[PDB]
Amino acid sequence: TSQVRQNYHQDSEAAINRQINLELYASYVYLSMSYYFDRDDVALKNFAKYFLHQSHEEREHAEKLMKLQNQRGGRIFLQDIKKPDCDDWESGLNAMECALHLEKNVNQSLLELHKLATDKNDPHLCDFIETHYLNEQVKAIKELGDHVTNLRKMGAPESGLAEYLFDKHTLG
Amino acid sequence: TSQVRQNYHQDSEAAINRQINLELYASYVYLSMSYYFDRDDVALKNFAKYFLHQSHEEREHAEKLMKLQNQRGGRIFLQDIKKPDCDDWESGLNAMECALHLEKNVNQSLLELHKLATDKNDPHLCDFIETHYLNEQVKAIKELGDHVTNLRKMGAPESGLAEYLFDKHTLG
Amino acid sequence: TSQVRQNYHQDSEAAINRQINLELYASYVYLSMSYYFDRDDVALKNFAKYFLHQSHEEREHAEKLMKLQNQRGGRIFLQDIKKPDCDDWESGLNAMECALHLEKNVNQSLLELHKLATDKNDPHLCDFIETHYLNEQVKAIKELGDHVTNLRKMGAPESGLAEYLFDKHTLG
Amino acid sequence: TSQVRQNYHQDSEAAINRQINLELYASYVYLSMSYYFDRDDVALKNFAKYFLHQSHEEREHAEKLMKLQNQRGGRIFLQDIKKPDCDDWESGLNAMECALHLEKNVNQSLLELHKLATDKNDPHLCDFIETHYLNEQVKAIKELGDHVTNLRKMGAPESGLAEYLFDKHTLG
Amino acid sequence: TSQVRQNYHQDSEAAINRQINLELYASYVYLSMSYYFDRDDVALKNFAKYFLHQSHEEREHAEKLMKLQNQRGGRIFLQDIKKPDCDDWESGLNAMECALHLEKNVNQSLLELHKLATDKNDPHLCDFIETHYLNEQVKAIKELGDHVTNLRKMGAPESGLAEYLFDKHTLG
Amino acid sequence: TSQVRQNYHQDSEAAINRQINLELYASYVYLSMSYYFDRDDVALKNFAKYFLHQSHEEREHAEKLMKLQNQRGGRIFLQDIKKPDCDDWESGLNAMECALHLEKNVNQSLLELHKLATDKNDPHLCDFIETHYLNEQVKAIKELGDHVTNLRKMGAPESGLAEYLFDKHTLG
């Protein structure tokens, strides 16, 4: 119906809307993580700053997907943003592991989106996904894996000195 | 239970959590409004920029309330962010009127919060609400009323030239 | 025969030559549009400047395709540049609609080229098309759609005040 | 019919349109020459740059003639731009000789145009031709003659060292 | 086994290791070429500088592939770097021809890698190859072809004046 | 045979070629070490940066030896660069110990080279070895010994906090 729509399948539009919702959910999860570490009984300032920065990046990703949906002539349809699975994250290492799991889930969703775009012969959507989302996801997963490895080697759960020093020297 | 908690009633904590959810909902509504005007069949760039700026301000307000909740020793509890009431907003004037209605609703919620804080003899919470939320809400309501009045005088619904010129000269 | 030719099918070379001709034709059409609005009985200076800028961009696109043809070891074969379908364009809105139609035609040609490159297993050609032509085409179509929508809302055909104000405020 | 038309004969308008077409054809020929020397089996970068610069100048000349046609109240009528007479130019010296022949042809056309303008008692058109086209044509012919003479003296056809050194020292 | 591994097939990992070895071999070959021209009985300084620059670029390409292997969770496995096929290269033209042959071989290897990645449905690897290796390879092949053509036209083997002047004017 | 050769014994030329191969092998070993620490399950960025810097320094040493071989009129003869003895280095301390062992081996080779040059009465070669290689080797051995001592005192193998803090404070 749109005057600008060309070679844009409806299934691609629906999948783009789903990815928008997933990105907003990830932003919400990162916000919850960030303000968990601002509590007085946790008090890890650099963890909070890191997760807040991640939350803002996820919001930017969702906005970029919405702009893409408008560019191709599709229609945005927003759903409810579900609350995160946890209220307390119990440690920096546990929050890092949960963030890694969430990023791998988002990467799987993006790979499904790219496969769908390939099946519909939509080169512009494929290139958009490759240029703006796949490499950023790979880099994020690699960085979170590095952080988890360093915290595990330091003795993160049992020794709070480990999380304290990781907060200053790596995330500071 | 918190080592920093002093003169902070549980009802105030619950009301602060509710206000956090309301602020996030307002941010979501403004994001929906902003990307409605980025569509090719609406194409009002300055309306979209205005509503995106409003959305970012609402997110900042929610983050400030979360910081306040952490400062006093309360615990943040997040709920689902409901999707906005509308998908298409049908005009700049209608979106402005809906934004005015939403801001008046938020002002009523903040006034209820202030009354609750007064009843519990919590001067810090009362002053926080007065300093950071009440005057900003009054200014926002006044500005939205001015915009609605100008659009109505210009003939906003029937004449698209009115919305075009308002987009360039007022919001540009 | 070329010492640099590798994995470059002849059908791809022929399609590249055809795309070169199409780009030059689009440049010619935009030049005709630009100097239509420089007439004393039309006198829309910013429309003329916009279409001249589009013409120069199309010439750049054709030159880039010729450079690509030389890079892979193919041979450029030029054809006649057909004169545009119209010499008088009758309004800014009509010229914008014709430009939108032309850009959608060029996008369809580029999509056919990308499909042909995919069928021949030529990743370099596919990436070249994706990187330099597909997103620019999508952006151009979106911008032309926005312009057409704004002109239609203002009342572009019947009211010359609409085209006058669009010339100053949007294209100026 | 034009409100600005004064002392502008129809034959002059037709001849101006013909000159516009000739200028566009010359631009096309120079583009073909320029990308002939970008081939890997020719590989004379400075020859290609020289001919591309000539092509851009010819396009500017055509645009100036179109502006002149609009200034006097005549109507532009575009024809097909014929493809150049050759695909391969076989040497720098041969391309230079062909460019010299083309420029002398364009000079003859401009002299016929000036004679026609003189016969119709149109001083503005005569002065426009004298100021913007005749001296530039004479300078171009002189420069091309100098280049042809130097290439012939160096032994351009048989010795490729001649064309190599001319590319670096004269056109570089 | 890696915590960051996702959608990364083992055959892709093995092919990445093979490409790493090929890149290191190319760097070694270019180093041999570079120091062949530093000999007192050859004494072409700019040829040596050119080939040393190529060697450093190949080392950078190998390091980038190793970084890619670490990013996706694969394991690097290094093999022996074979000595180059020749120790004396006998002329600048012969070295240029051998470099062209080597670059075409590397391009064929990269195309096989891209085909393998496509067959395994690995969009990130495909985009990495397209973004960082395919266009650089095409440009390198085009430049080497240009150099070979110019040297052949000047009379590179029989006339040492040709190689001397090419060393100063093109590679200097 | 070389016109520049003077007081340059064949055994010295062969030993110089062997030292070139040894330097290239050391560069390869350091590259392997550097990218071992870039893995997600090791994740010691500063160790990786240190070993990459060492690898580049070894490549520079090999290039300097090749330049020396060309200066005196000898002929470079390259051999295969053997793959390093290990794939995984298992700790920062173990990699440091292996680097120390490798540097002591290289120092022994250089001392044998200097003794050979002394026996052949070649003062220029002796002074070249003394000026550019012996003191650098002594400094490298001293620095690696310091690093090994500090890691051992910190408790490097059993305690990963030791390697983490050494990575930030010494190598950072």
Distant-in-sequence, close-in-space partners of F92: CB < 8 Å, separation ≥ 6 = F37, F44, F47, F151, F156, F163, F166, F167
E-chain residues within 8 Å CB-CB of F77? 87
CA B164 to chain centre: 25
Q: Is residue D168 within 8 Å of residue E168, measured between CB atoms?
A: no
Interfacial residues of B (vs A; Cβ cutoff 8 Å): 2-4, 28, 31-32, 35, 38-41, 59, 63, 66-67, 70, 73, 75-84, 87
- Which residue's entry shows tokens 């680097």? F99
CA dihedral sign of residues E58, E62, E63, E68: positive
CA dihedral sign of residues E108, E110, E116, E118: negative
Q: How close are the terminal C-alpha atoms of chain A, in Å?
A: 51
Which token pair is A128? 């958009």
Q: Is residue A7 within 8 Å of residue A122, measured between CB atoms?
A: yes
Q: Is residue D43 within 8 Å of residue D105, measured between CB atoms?
A: no
Nearest to F135 by CA among F105, F107, F99, F102: F107
CATH number at residue D151: 1.20.1260.10
Query: What's phi and psi for B91, nearest 5 deg?
Result: 180, 160
Task: Give CA–CA dist A155/A96, Å, rounded.
Answer: 14
B-chain residues within 8 Å CB-CB of C147? 43
Q: How many CB atoms lie within 10 A of CB B11?
A: 11
Q: Is residue C66 within 8 Å of residue C76, measured between CB atoms?
A: yes
Task: Give CA–CA dist C157/D6, Å, rounded.
Answer: 30
Which token pair is A108? 């799987």
Q: Is residue D43 within 8 Å of residue E149, measured between CB atoms?
A: yes
| DSSP code per residue over chain A | --TT--S--HHHHHHHHHHHHHHHHHHHHHHHHHHHTTSTTT--HHHHHHHHHHHHHHHHHHHHHHHHHHHTT-------BPPPS-S---SHHHHHHHHHHHHHHHHHHHHHHHHHHHHTT-HHHHHHHIIIIIHHHHHHHHHHHHHHHHHHHHTTTT-HHHHHHHHHHT--
Q: How close are the terminal C-alpha atoms of chain D, in Å?
A: 51
Length of chain E: 172
Q: Report if residue C35 sits inside a domain.
A: yes
Query: Vertex D85, ends D80 and D88: CA angle to 5°?
Result: 130
Interface test with D, best of C31, C52, C85 (most D CBs within 10 A): C31
B-chain residues within 8 Å CB-CB of C155? 160-161
Q: Do chains D and B touch (3 or more CB pairs under 8 A)?
A: no
Query: What's phi and psi for C39, nearest 5 deg?
Result: -65, 155
Length of chain B: 172
From the CA of D153, how many Å to the nearest CA of chain C?
A: 31
Task: Give CA–CA dist B166/F108, Å, rounded.
Answer: 83
Distant-in-sequence, close-in-space partners of D124: CB < 8 Å, separation ≥ 6 = D7, D72
Q: C81 vs D41: CB contact, 8 Å cut-off? A: no
Partnered with residue D81 across adjacent β-strands are: C81
Task: Give CA–CA dist D30/D34, Å, rounded.
Answer: 6
Query: Per residue, what are the HEC states of C3-30?
Result: CCCCCCCHHHHHHHHHHHHHHHHHHHHH
Q: Is residue A155 within 8 Å of residue F160, measured between CB atoms?
A: yes
- Which residue's entry shows tokens 């995106």? B52
Q: Which residues of D113-128 are buried (b: 16+ CB within 10 A; e: fewer)?
A: bbebbeebebeebbeb
Instruction: Name the residue among B35, B66, B73 with its Cβ closest to that of A76.
Output: B35
Task: Give CA–CA dist A112/A67, Å, rounded.
Answer: 20
F53 annotated as belonging to a binding site for a ligand: no
Task: Give CA–CA dist D135/D126, Å, rounded.
Answer: 13
Which token pair is C62? 């054709």
Task: Give CA–CA dist D90/C66, Å, rounded.
Answer: 19
Nearest to C75 by CA among C66, C62, C84: C66
Q: Report if residue C43 sits inside a domain.
A: yes
E-chain residues within 8 Å CB-CB of D91? none
Task: Give CA–CA dist F172/F168, Å, rounded.
Answer: 5
The helices-and-strands tally (H runs, E runs) of chain C is: 6, 0
C-chain residues within 8 Å CB-CB of B168? 169
- Please report how many Cα atoms fall inside a 13 Å half-sphere around the Cα of residue D155, on the Cβ side: 6
Q: Is residue C5 within 8 Å of residue C72, measured between CB atoms?
A: yes
Supply the Cα-derived Rg of chain E in whole angstroms: 18
Distant-in-sequence, close-in-space partners of A20: CB < 8 Å, separation ≥ 6 = A62, A65, A66, A69, A76, A78
Task: Give CA–CA dist C33/F75, Å, rounded.
Answer: 69
Length of chain F: 172
- Which residue's entry shows tokens 């645009």? D63
CA dihedral sign of residues A47, A53, A54, A56: positive
Length of chain C: 172
Q: E123 vs A130: CB contact, 8 Å cut-off? A: yes
Looking at residue D150, its amino acid is: N
Instruction: Name the residue among D41, D161, D168 with its Cβ closest to that of E149.
Output: D41
From the CA of A162, how many Å to the nearest CA of chain F?
A: 8
Residues of the domain holding C28? 10-170
Q: Is residue E131 within 8 Å of residue A127, measured between CB atoms?
A: no
Q: D76 vs C2: CB contact, 8 Å cut-off? A: no
Q: Which residues of F23-45 are buried (b: 16+ CB within 10 A; e: fewer)?
A: bbbbbbbbbbbbbbbbbbbbbbb
Q: Is residue C56 within 8 Å of residue C77, measured between CB atoms?
A: no
Nearest to B103 by CA among B53, B142, B68: B142
Q: E141 vs C7: CB contact, 8 Å cut-off? A: no
Helix axes A45-71, A160-169, angle to 10 degrees: 60
Task: Give CA–CA dist E137/E57, Å, rounded.
Answer: 12
Distant-in-sequence, close-in-space partners of A166: CB < 8 Å, separation ≥ 6 = A92, A147, A150, A151, A154, A156
Which token pair is C83? 């004169």
Interface test with A, best of F161, F163, F166 (most A CBs within 10 A): F161
Q: Is residue E11 within 8 Å of residue E116, measured between CB atoms?
A: yes
Looking at residue B14, its amino acid is: A
- Please report how many Cα atoms fall inside a 13 Å half-sphere around the Cα of residue D62, on the Cβ side: 26
| DSSP code per residue over E144-172 | HHHHHHHHHHHTTTT-HHHHHHHHHHT--
Binding residues of D for Fe cation: 23, 58, 61, 103, 137
Task: Give CA–CA dist D39/F30, Å, rounded.
Answer: 43
> Residue E119 burial by CB count (10 A; 0-12/13-18/19+): exposed, middle or buried?
exposed
Which token pair is F44? 């010691």
Q: B81 vs A81: CB contact, 8 Å cut-off? A: yes
Closest-CA residue in chain E for F5?
E40
From the CA of B147, how many Å to the nearest CA of chain C?
A: 20
Distant-in-sequence, close-in-space partners of A88: CB < 8 Å, separation ≥ 6 = A36
Neighbours of chain D (3+ CB pairs under 8 A): C, E
Q: Do chains B and A touch (3 or more CB pairs under 8 A)?
A: yes
Which token pair is C160? 């010359």
Which token pair is D168? 């670096």
Partnered with residue E128 across adjacent β-strands are: none
Experimental method: cryo-EM
User: Please, where are the H alpha helices in chain F?
Assistant: 10-36, 45-71, 92-119, 123-129, 135-154, 160-169
Which token pair is B76? 């943040």
Which token pair is D164? 């190599």
Q: Is residue F116 within 8 Å of residue F15, measured between CB atoms?
A: yes
Q: Report if residue D140 sits inside a domain.
A: yes
B-chain residues within 8 Å CB-CB of C142? 40
User: Please, where are the H alpha helices in chain B?
Assistant: 10-36, 45-71, 92-119, 123-129, 135-154, 160-169
Residue B36 is given by DSSP the state: H
Q: Is residue B31 within 8 Å of residue B52, measured between CB atoms?
A: yes
Q: Report if residue F152 sits inside a domain.
A: yes
User: Please, where are the H alpha helices in chain D?
Assistant: 10-36, 45-71, 92-119, 123-129, 135-154, 160-169
Q: Report if residue C162 sits inside a domain.
A: yes
Query: What's phi and psi for E113, nearest 5 deg?
Result: -60, -45
Task: Give CA–CA dist A71/A3, Å, rounded.
Answer: 11
Which token pair is E56? 């450093």
Longest dimension (CA), chain A: 61
**Documented resolution in Å:** 2.4
Domain count, chain E: 1
Q: How many CB atoms lie within 10 A of CB C103?
A: 25
Q: Is residue A121 within 8 Å of residue A132, measured between CB atoms?
A: no
Helix (H, G, I), strand (E, B) or coil at F81: strand
Partnered with residue A81 across adjacent β-strands are: B81
Q: How close are the terminal C-alpha atoms of chain F, in Å?
A: 51
Partnered with residue C81 across adjacent β-strands are: D81
Distant-in-sequence, close-in-space partners of D23: CB < 8 Å, separation ≥ 6 = D58, D59, D61, D62, D65, D106
Q: Is residue B102 within 8 Å of residue B109, measured between CB atoms?
A: no
Helix axes C160-169, C45-71, angle to 10 degrees: 60
CA distances (Å), origin B36, targets A123, B162, C168, D147 = 26, 18, 25, 62
Residue F130 is given by DSSP the state: I
| DSSP code per residue over B103-114 | HHHHHHHHHHHH
Closest-CA residue in chain B for C164?
B161
Task: Give CA–CA dist B18/F52, Å, rounded.
Answer: 54
Which token pair is A142? 């690699």
Task: Give CA–CA dist B51/E153, Å, rounded.
Answer: 65
Task: Give CA–CA dist F79/D88, Å, rounded.
Answer: 48
Task: Give CA–CA dist B164/B172, Å, rounded.
Answer: 10
> Residue C11 burial by CB count (10 A; 0-12/13-18/19+): exposed, middle or buried?
exposed
Supply the Cα-derived Rg of chain F in whole angstroms: 18
Interface test with F, best of A97, A143, A151, A154 (most F CBs within 10 A): A154
CA distances (Å), origin B138, targets B21, C5, E147 = 20, 70, 73
Task: Give CA–CA dist F43/A149, Å, rounded.
Answer: 7
A-chain residues within 8 Å CB-CB of C130? 123-124, 126-127
CA dihedral sign of residues F53, F57, F63, F66: negative
Which token pair is C49? 């400047």
Closest-CA residue in chain E for F1?
E41
Q: Is residue A4 within 8 Å of residue C142, measured between CB atoms?
A: yes
| DSSP code per residue over E50-109 | HHHHHHHHHHHHHHHHHHHHHHTT-------BPPPS-S---SHHHHHHHHHHHHHHHHHH
Nearest to E77 by CA among E19, E120, E3: E19
Instruction: Name the residue among E59, E77, E80 with its Cβ closest to that of F82.
Output: E80
CA distances (Å), origin E96, targets A108, C70, E92, E142, E167 = 46, 20, 6, 12, 12
Q: Report if residue F25 sits inside a domain.
A: yes
Query: Vertex B107, ends B106 and B112: CA angle to 5°?
Result: 100
Nearest to B147 by CA among B161, B135, B162, B126: B162
CA distances (Å), origin B26, targets A17, A52, A72, B85, B105 = 20, 20, 27, 11, 10
Task: Give CA–CA dist E36/F87, Å, rounded.
Answer: 33
Binding residues of A: 23, 58, 61, 103, 137
Q: Is residue F27 within 8 Å of residue F49, measured between CB atoms?
A: no
Q: How many CB atoms lie within 10 A of CB B139?
A: 11
Looking at residue C23, its amino acid is: E
CA C172 to chain centre: 21
Query: Vertex F147, ends F145 and F149: CA angle to 5°?
Result: 70
Supply the Cα-derived Rg of chain D in whole angstroms: 18
Task: Give CA–CA dist F152/F172, Å, rounded.
Answer: 18
Partnered with residue F81 across adjacent β-strands are: E81
Query: Vertex D164, ends D159 and D166: CA angle to 5°?
Result: 100
Q: How many CB atoms lie within 10 A of CB B125?
A: 23
Residue C81 is given by DSSP the state: B
Binding residues of A for Fe cation: 23, 58, 61, 103, 137
Q: C28 vs D3: CB contact, 8 Å cut-off? A: no
Task: Give CA–CA dist A127/F10, Å, rounded.
Answer: 60
Task: Give CA–CA dist F108/F110, Å, rounded.
Answer: 5
Q: Do chains D and A touch (3 or more CB pairs under 8 A)?
A: no
Supply the Cα-derived Rg of chain B in whole angstroms: 18
Q: Report if residue D1 sits inside a domain.
A: no
Q: Report if residue E68 sits inside a domain.
A: yes
Helix (H, G, I), strand (E, B) or coil at D81: strand
Helix (H, G, I), strand (E, B) or coil at D35: helix
Q: F161 vs A154: CB contact, 8 Å cut-off? A: yes
Which token pair is F88? 């995984």
Instruction: Name the residue among A147, A149, A154 with its Cβ closest to that of F41.
Output: A149
From the CA of E23, how many Å to the nearest CA of chain F?
A: 13
Helix (H, G, I), strand (E, B) or coil at B170: coil
Looking at residue C2, its amino acid is: S
Looking at residue F46, its amino acid is: N
Distant-in-sequence, close-in-space partners of B14: CB < 8 Å, separation ≥ 6 = none
Query: Vertex D98, ends D96 and D99: CA angle to 5°?
Result: 65
